[PDB]
From Swiss-Prot:
Coiled coil: none annotated. This is Epi-isozizaene synthase. It comes from Streptomyces coelicolor (strain ATCC BAA-471 / A3(2) / M145). Its cofactor is Mg(2+); Mn(2+); Fe(3+). Mg(2+) 2 binds at residues 84, 88. Mg(2+) 1 binds at residues 84, 88. InterPro entries: Isoprenoid_synthase_dom_sf (IPR008949), IsozizSyn (IPR054543), Terpene_cyclase-like_2 (IPR034686). The gene is cyc1. Keywords: Lyase, Magnesium, Metal-binding.
Length: 340
């Protein structure tokens, strides 16, 4: 049962949850990886890792992925959550120098992961290990696009460091543009392709129906996170959240901003439903009778199916994960799974 202020009946009725068959082994394998890469203290991994549900989130998203692909995606995604925690803690503790150094190492490790596999900063070494494995599935042209996208993500995190140290809440339009980068919209979209086993040519993945379906899936996910993580983010002096931008710059009340965010999330769903039809029609056109065409057709169909699965996986993740349960913390500004 989902709280009424967070409930989306269309998701519950029309987007049935999916779970990848590898998820049991995925759960333990990623937890051991967090342990062995020293990405979180051992006692916090034991106490909190399974309850954070990071592997469940990815296992309900990239259906059909080969087990080894899903493992690399799950390790990268767990790393990404820890990086968000590190970013937050560097901000809270005014560690501008340590962040600047981290920011630079992640740029370098993204271009040359093998050089960073044993870096003294375990967060860098953990990133390099996951990126190394992601680079082993598709041609170097896909690797280059992943890197180009993630370079921008790192720099969007640096913009968040600038905003939060300076006490700046971005405007609504400014926030929406930045959120497509801090959420890594295009990274999750890139990773559809190794999950279906096919790098898509530019003419396919830029087709208007594919691009708009991919966008809507990510806008829903990011804004639903905003809706669900608003309580912890207000408690933690986070400034990056559509709700916070609305309260600050449009002088909405909390209740008004929650409603506005809800409506925007709801429209992503029904816009997606319409564009989903066009994207599946495109998949049908790709099946032109050739072997390449059937290949491309099946890949697009699988990818669009997983764009749909992102809606349900993100929805349920926010009600299962301990990441957001701010009411259970002794210090509402300091989550217990963060190294402070
Ligand atoms: C801050 C963590 N995360 C994912 C690693 C960064 C993009 C956002 C997120 C939250 C909830 C579901 C999916 C992604
Ligand atoms: Mg965060
Ligand atoms: Mg963040
Ligand atoms: Mg959030």
């Amino acid at each position: 049962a989902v709280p009424p202020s967070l409930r989306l009946p269309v998701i519950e009725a029309a987007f049935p949850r999916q779970l990848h068959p590898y998820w049991p082994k995925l759960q333990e394998t990623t937890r051991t990886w967090l342990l062995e890469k020293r990405l979180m203290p051992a006692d916090k991994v034991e106490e909190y890792a399974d309850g954070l549900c990071y592997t469940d989130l990815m296992a309900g998203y990239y259906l059909g992925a080969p087990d080894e692909v899903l493992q690399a995606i799950a390790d990268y995604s767990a790393w990404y959550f820890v990086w968000d925690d590190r970013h937050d803690r560097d901000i809270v503790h005014g560690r501008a120098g340590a962040w600047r150094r981290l920011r630079g190492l992640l740029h370098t490790a993204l271009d040359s992961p093998g050089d960073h596999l044993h870096h003294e900063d375990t967060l860098v070494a953990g990133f390099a290990d996951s990126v190394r494995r992601l680079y082993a599935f598709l041609p170097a042209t896909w690797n280059a696009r992943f890197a180009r996208h993630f370079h921008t993500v790192i720099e969007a995190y640096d913009r968040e460091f600038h905003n939060r140290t300076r006490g700046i809440v971005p405007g609504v339009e400014e926030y929406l543009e930045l959120r497509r980068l801090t959420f890594a919209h295009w990274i999750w979209t890139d990773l559809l392709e190794p999950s279906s086993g096919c790098e898509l040519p530019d003419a396919v993945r830029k087709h208007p129906a594919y691009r708009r379906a991919a966008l809507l899936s990510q806008e829903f996910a990011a804004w639903y996170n905003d809706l669900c993580s608003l309580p912890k983010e207000i408690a933690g002096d986070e400034v990056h959240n559509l709700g916070i931008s609305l309260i600050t710059h449009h002088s909405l009340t909390l209740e008004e901003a929650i409603g506005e965010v809800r409506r925007r999330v709801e429209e992503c769903i029904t816009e997606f439903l319409a564009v989903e039809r066009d994207a599946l029609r495109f998949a049908d056109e790709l099946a032109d009778g050739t072997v390449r065409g059937k290949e491309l057709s099946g890949a697009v169909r699988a990818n669009v199916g997983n764009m749909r699965n992102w809606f349900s996986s993100v929805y349920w993740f926010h009600h299962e994960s301990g990441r957001y349960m701010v009411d259970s913390w002794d210090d509402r500004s300091t989550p217990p799974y963060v190294n402070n």
